[PDB]
Amino acid sequence: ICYDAFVSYSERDAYWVENLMVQELENFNPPFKLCLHKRDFIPGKWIIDNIIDSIEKSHKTVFVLSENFVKSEWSKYELLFAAILILLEPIEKKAIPQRFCKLRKIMNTKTYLEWPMDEAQREGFWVNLRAAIKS
Template sequence: MSVRRNKLNSFSREEFESFKNMELLDASDNNFICSCEFLAFIQHEAGIARVLVGWPDEYRCDSPLVVRGVQVGAVHLSLMECHQSLVVSLICVLVVLVILVLVAVGYKYHAVWYLRMTWAWLQAKRKPKRAPAKDICYDAFVSYSENDSGWVEDIMVRELEQACPPFRLCLHKRDFVPGKWIVDNIIDSIEKSHKTLFVLSEHFVQSEWCKYELDFSH
């Protein structure tokens, strides 16, 4: 069979099997569309080279443009070109998985909390060094570890608040505003106090909250 120099642009396995008694096929000098399906068939079909007359020199691609004029047997399209929808789907799945992993890691390590804390710290850095005297409510904000609360609250605070004249102390258990974010409470309490009193101990050094209070006071 000869369909040379015709308008044939491709043929499939099904079309080829329709002519089971055909011994030779001259389909040279046609404008072949080198699609993934056509290339997969013509390059991997066993015995196709023995049937096609003039193979491979006279079988060239007309499209796509990047392979125009190239022998059909020498064209190799990329995975992205042949399975574009599959590749896009895999990329979307990977992006979703990465986002889920980042959200899970951020949740586990309290990333949102640290970002809010950093933002609050930056805002505190931009504030004036001293609050107006009329906004001062306490003589000192007391920063201490919860593990030292027995000594601080039962002895130190009692002695200072019952002194003559008494000291006005700000304690997180007693004076923080309920429902307000703890970092905002810390910053407001420091700003409303003349001084910040740190109860230094091994527990203080090991406490993340005490470190934050130390940084905010600086």
């Protein structure tokens, strides 16, 4: 085991993950060891490779859910269920196709963390996230 978490996010949500989340975690004290998929990996796309082995070499895996993540990043996983979900923006459970089940399942169960649209509550969001990670 090498990192405390594998963060699977989408190139669009990149800003949030590589900037803000990285700030509230990799710059914590003591710091968290993060393996950001989109930042650390060759921007080419894959599966067997790393992902699993990279995941299995990190204490936890974070899926930064959002509509962007559905379009382009989920598609693979459907085709770890330990796993920490993060709902960055509200996704319409319905608006989610019926061919993307495992998501729905893992979704509805509610083993997820919801990022707040209210600046004030962010301070707490992390607190729960770090806790979840360090769980």
